[PDB]
Design a protein around this nucleic acid. Structure first.
Lengths: 238, 211, 101, 55, 70, 434
RNA sequence: GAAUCUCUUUGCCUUUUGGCUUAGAUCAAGUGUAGUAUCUGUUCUGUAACAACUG
RNA sequence: GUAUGUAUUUAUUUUAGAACUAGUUACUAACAUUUUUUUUUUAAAAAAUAAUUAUAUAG
């Protein structure tokens, strides 16, 4: 129901630059197809060009100093029109270098495809938005939200369902207790032959290896306190 | 206006959005113990889970299970000091002083080079006002050649007890356990504060002839 | 002053607790040779004060951490994040990178 | 103190880390100088040969 | 996710010592080597005619790689 | 350390290994020094074992040993890393140490090429006019070989659908896309990245360079125009092979036949001898300096075409997560790469032959010669070099001598290289096939 | 000097990224009908006192 | 479409709101079967060509 966009080179707007930035923060630099899937009407290579040429904060967009500018005239003299090598020598993007070289030596129609669109300035947007851009930001927030797998999401669901299942299981017992028939709570079943129930025994009980001092009366005081707590939970209910 | 920070504020705000008898208590307990023993059968390490599971058995007012859990927690990792301190405190807060005395004994005899354990046992015996035990504890604690924090603590103890005759005996061993001039000068300043001219003079002479 | 060791923080904690014990004070041994056990005769009071002291101190430290959590959860002026745990991770990165260089 | 590790490949808990965090020799000149001199030399020689042709 | 652990321990040999064994006989524990040993012109027209301890920076790797890439 | 920190320390080991594979330098800003030394030590260990295992498994793949499918995919993926790492270090050492081309060599090469093109009276290939008379048919032929790839398959990934859409558009409005090509050949000098992938052949590994589809149309048009106009002006002489006239078995058939038809070549009655030498010209493409290429190539074309050609090479090269800027080599995957390849081979063919035998083998430009023919028999016999031909890398030379010439030549060689122990026969290579 | 409450820097970081390999690999152009999700628009806004009984 | 997992108790253990309205996006679903070659003009003109399909797909 969208007709297919076969050629996806366009003009970079503001929306796509900002979604590319908030996608590179989460997805990282070397996954480009997963970045460019987040914003339609652009390609994984054109996302890579828009990062490495324009949106990168390491890139040097300032005015040229006088030593920089004389260095540019000399390097453009020595290396004839090898602009990637020159731009590597200046730590500046190559499009900046070419346009500033044109400004030194000086002293698009409609219906054309612009090849240099990734290196050029963005277009700010009309005031409300377009509808497809509303859809783009909605699905982009939806894909930047999730940090879980299938197993973990199913675990969230299973914990909630077991919780509500226990609540219903206690509800019926409280109703039958009001009626006067005391159904004891059934236990979960063991999945294997030596699966351990944890109210029968202290399961790996380690005694504290007695010393020189005497602990009879403190034992009696603890035993009194615990017996009284269990009786109070039986009568009054915590 | 749209920027990446406003997108991520929207994403953050989006993703941010009855025991009545004893049988319900036993079911709550069985379920929670299956939980904790599962996460400790899988990861034998992670002392924080051991302390939380021990605190759970403290909240159930069952002290024997909490003791067994703390002992099983020490068998994995005896080098871990906050576990020793929780188990001593978990004895003390329920007013079981002899269990914690046995425990502080086993702690300072297991790890004698750890300073905080001896000081814990000294706090506990001060708080109960047992001055003979605190003197005996600092006596053994000074006997093992500890370091100057232990010695300054013992000279402060015997200042607070106003046993003026004993502080000279402590410094007379402390100038041999640590020979510097700062220890001789500490005994100098004590003899100027709480001694005669003649004692301070003899202390100075005993300094200078050995030097 | 920087980071403090454990042998020094131990002494400062001991001295603060004794200072507390002095202001709180302001406001035998029997060896049974049959078993070898020592019964120390301690008063019931000063045990209750020790237990209530430890309980009140743990509650005080607990409430201080609880209030620090809310006052560190209000301030959003660090960085952009997507959940409650990313905020703590990004504040950790700010604390390391501000101190380092 | 070892800093915390941020990787540009893997992001297991899927966080959103700060975007600032994740990201001549003389023979060149001498060569190009000799090629320019060779150009001017070849043009001078071909103009001399042209003038000796028209004689 | 969360099934991908860096192993941070190892299975202790003491942990499987109180087990009661079984007695299956293995093919690699049959008797074998039961005995123990014991000690007691035309050449003129031309214009030109007259171990570094790192493996990737060696010459063997460069001759390999200059052979196999064509 | 208390033990929670350890599993966070090892993440630098994992990240440092990932940076080793991708040839990214791995500096951590606030790292303590001996811990960085420990990690750098253990990563050099792991990488040594990695490189050794790649070599061992490629030798077992060459010999013919049994090997899985997954193991051959893993070995191709290992060797592509090793190749591009050698390539990046070669680019870096060239940028550091300066060129090896040493300006005196470049001066005399430029003089040889100007002298040859003045003997030919070559007229340089212009920029294509705004109304070129052959222009639509050259566009048809140039879109044909781009279309030919997609004749087979109907299952298409999105990059192929992008290419087919561009081809169908260029077929639908031909004048508009031709005007666009004319604009890009004049005012474009910064190009997009170029991927490289490896296609294996089980005895060796081979590169495939894949260009942007919009630039590829322009390179195909420039390719077709360059070969058409160079053929109209007789740039390449007769020895330059592969030619359009003949299939390779017809080439080897003609070459044996022409070896037979030389004058008295099989005569041996007076001690005379003939010598066939045949040898590869080495790494001819990967030593092409761009500044020398521009000045060598401005002799034959328009300056703007020359600037496009020597600016199209300086691009960025990408395997999976590894890029580098190609500063010194010739990319073979460009559509117009074959023309540059043969022209540089013509420079080397002139340096091998010389001016006097290149005009004998070529013949005067008013009427050129045949492939292995001379205008008279005494022009054939005026020199020992009798036949010469060059296929892509390889040269073939046929010498004839008398007795005296061969004796006085081996006297020169055994003057500057004596062998009293008679070990000239052990280094010598001949075909064990026969 | 000393305690109680409360706020700053300073320590502590306390829900504070838990393996491997060929970046593990590939690719996101189908119609109806149906389910789920969300998103735009319009209108309207008995009580008190007095007389009597204390059962 | 498999794998794999989950659910299925009776034979009784003593005492700020209110109302109205319709389509646009994604994702999922073993759930479902209107020709070929052109030409020409600005709808009409020409030319042309030949007893009828699968129940089969899985990590």
């Amino acid at each position: 129901p969208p007709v297919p966009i076969y050629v996806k080179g366009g003009v970079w707007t503001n929306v796509e630059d900002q979604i590319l930035k908030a996608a590179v923060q989460k997805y990282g630099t070397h996954q480009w197809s997963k970045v460019a899937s987040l914003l339609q009407k652009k390609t994984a290579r054109q996302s890579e060009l828009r990062w490495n040429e324009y949106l990168n904060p390491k890139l040097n967009f300032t005015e040229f100093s006088k030593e920089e500018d004389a260095q540019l005239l000399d390097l453009a003299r020595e290396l004839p029109n090898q602009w990637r090598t020159i731009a590597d020598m200046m730590a500046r993007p190559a499009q900046v270098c070419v346009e500033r070289y044109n400004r030194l030596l000086e002293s698009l129609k409609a219906g054309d495809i612009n090849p240099n669109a990734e290196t050029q300035m963005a277009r700010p947007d009309n005031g409300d938005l377009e509808d497809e851009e509303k859809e783009m930001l909605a699905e982009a927030r939806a894909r930047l939200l999730n940090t879980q797998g299938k197993k973990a999401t199913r675990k969230i669901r299973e914990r909630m369902l077991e919780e509500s299942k226990r609540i219903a299981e206690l509800q019926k017992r409280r109703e039958l207790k009001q009626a006067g028939i005391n159904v004891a709570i059934k236990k979960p079943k063991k999945k294997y032959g030596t699966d351990i129930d944890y109210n029968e025994d202290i399961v790996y009980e380690q005694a504290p290896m007695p010393g020189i001092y005497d602990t009879s009366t403190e034992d009696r005081q603890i035993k009194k306190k615990f017996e009284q707590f269990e009786r109070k939970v039986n009568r009054k209910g915590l | 206006h749209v920027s990446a920070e406003q997108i991520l504020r929207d994403v953050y705000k989006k993703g941010q959005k009855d025991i009545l008898d004893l049988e319900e208590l036993r079911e709550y307990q069985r379920r929670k113990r299956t939980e904790y023993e599962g996460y400790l059968k899988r990861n034998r390490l992670d002392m924080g889970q051991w302390i939380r599971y021990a605190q759970f058995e403290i909240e159930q007012h069952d002290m024997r299970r909490a003791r067994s859990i703390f002992e099983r927690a020490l068998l994995v990792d005896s080098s871990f000091i906050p576990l020793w301190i929780r188990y001593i405190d978990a004895e003390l807060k329920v007013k079981c002083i002899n269990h914690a005395r046995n425990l502080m004994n086993r702690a300072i005899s297991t790890l004698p080079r750890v300073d905080k354990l001896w000081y814990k046992y000294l706090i506990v015996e001060e708080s109960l006002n047992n001055v003979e035990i605190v003197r005996s504890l600092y006596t053994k604690w000074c006997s093992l050649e500890p370091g100057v924090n232990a010695w300054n603590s013992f000279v402060d103890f015997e200042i607070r007890q106003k046993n003026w005759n004993g502080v000279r005996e402590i410094y007379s061993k402390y100038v041999m356990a640590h020979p510097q001039m700062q220890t001789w000068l500490k005994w100098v300043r004590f003899e100027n504060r709480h001694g005669n001219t003649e004692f301070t003079r003899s202390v100075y002479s005993l300094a200078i002839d050995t030097v | 002053r920087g980071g403090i060791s454990y042998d020094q923080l131990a002494k400062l904690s001991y001295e603060k607790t004794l200072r507390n014990l002095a202001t709180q004070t302001q406001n035998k041994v029997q060896k049974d040779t049959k078993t070898g056990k020592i019964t120390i005769a301690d008063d019931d009071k000063l045990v209750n004060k020790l237990a209530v002291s430890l309980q009140s101190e743990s509650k005080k430290r607990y409430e201080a951490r609880k209030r620090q959590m809310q006052n560190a959860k209000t301030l959003y002026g660090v960085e952009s994040f997507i959940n409650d745990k990313n905020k703590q991770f990004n504040e950790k990165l700010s604390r390391e990178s501000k101190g380092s260089e | 103190k070892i800093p915390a590790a941020v990787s540009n490949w893997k992001n297991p808990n899927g966080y959103t880390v700060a975007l600032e965090r994740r990201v001549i020799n003389d023979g060149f000149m001498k060569l190009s100088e000799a090629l320019e001199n060779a150009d001017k030399k070849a043009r001078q020689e071909i103009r001399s040969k042209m003038e000796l042709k028209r004689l | 996710t969360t099934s991908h652990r860096p192993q941070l321990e190892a299975r202790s040999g003491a942990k499987a010592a109180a087990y009661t064994p079984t007695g299956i006989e293995h093919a690699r524990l049959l008797p074998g080597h039961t005995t123990l040993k014991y000690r007691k012109s035309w050449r003129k027209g031309t214009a030109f005619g007259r171990y570094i301890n790192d493996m990737t920076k060696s010459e063997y790797h460069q001759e390999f790689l200059h052979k196999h890439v064509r | 350390i208390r033990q929670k920190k350890a599993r966070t320390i090892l993440q630098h080991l994992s990240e440092a290994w990932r940076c080793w594979k991708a040839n990214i330098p791995w500096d951590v800003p606030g790292m303590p020094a001996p811990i960085k030394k420990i990690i750098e030590r253990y990563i050099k260990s792991k990488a040594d074992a990695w490189v050794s295992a790649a070599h061992y498994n490629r030798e077992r793949i060459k010999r013919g040993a049994h090997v899985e499918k997954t193991m051959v995919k893993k070995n191709l993926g290992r060797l592509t890393r090793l190749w591009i790492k050698n390539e990046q270090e070669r680019q870096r050492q060239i940028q550091k140490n300066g060129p090896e081309i040493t300006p005196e060599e470049a001066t005399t090469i430029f003089s040889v090429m100007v002298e040859w093109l003045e003997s030919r009276s070559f007229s340089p290939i212009p920029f294509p006019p705004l109304t070129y008379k052959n222009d639509t048919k050259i566009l048809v032929l140039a879109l044909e070989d781009l279309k030919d790839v997609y004749a087979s398959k109907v299952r298409l990934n999105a990059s192929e659908r992008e290419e087919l859409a561009l081809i169908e558009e260029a077929y639908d409005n031909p004048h508009d896309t031709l005007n666009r090509i004319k604009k890009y050949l004049l005012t474009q000098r910064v190009f997009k990245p170029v991927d490289i992938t490896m296609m294996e052949n089980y005895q060796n590994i081979s590169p495939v360079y894949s260009v942007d589809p919009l630039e590829k149309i322009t390179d195909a048009y420039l390719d077709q125009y360059l070969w058409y106009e160079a053929d109209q002006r007789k740039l390449f002489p007769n020895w330059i092979k592969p030619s359009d006239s003949e299939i390779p078995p017809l080439l080897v058939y003609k070459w044996t036949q022409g070896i037979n038809n030389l004058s008295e070549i099989w005569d041996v009655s007076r001690g005379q001898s003939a010598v066939l030498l045949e040898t590869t010209l080495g790494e001819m493409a990967e030593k092409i300096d761009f500044t020398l290429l521009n000045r060598l190539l401005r002799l034959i074309v328009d300056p703007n075409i020359a600037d496009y050609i020597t600016a199209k090479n300086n691009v960025v090269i990408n395997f999976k997560d590894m890029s580098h800027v190609n500063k010194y080599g010739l990319i073979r995957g460009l559509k117009f790469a074959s023309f540059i390849f043969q022209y540089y081979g013509l420079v080397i063919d002139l340096l091998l032959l010389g001016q006097e035998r290149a005009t004998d083998l070529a013949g005067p430009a008013n009427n050129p010669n045949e492939f292995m023919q001379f205008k008279s028999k005494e022009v054939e016999k005026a020199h020992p070099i009798r036949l010469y031909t060059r296929y892509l890398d390889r040269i073939y030379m046929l010498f004839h001598f008398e007795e005296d010439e061969g004796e006085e030549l081996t006297d020169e060689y055994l003057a500057e290289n004596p062998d009293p122990n008679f070990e000239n026969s052990i280094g010598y290579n001949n075909r064990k096939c026969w």
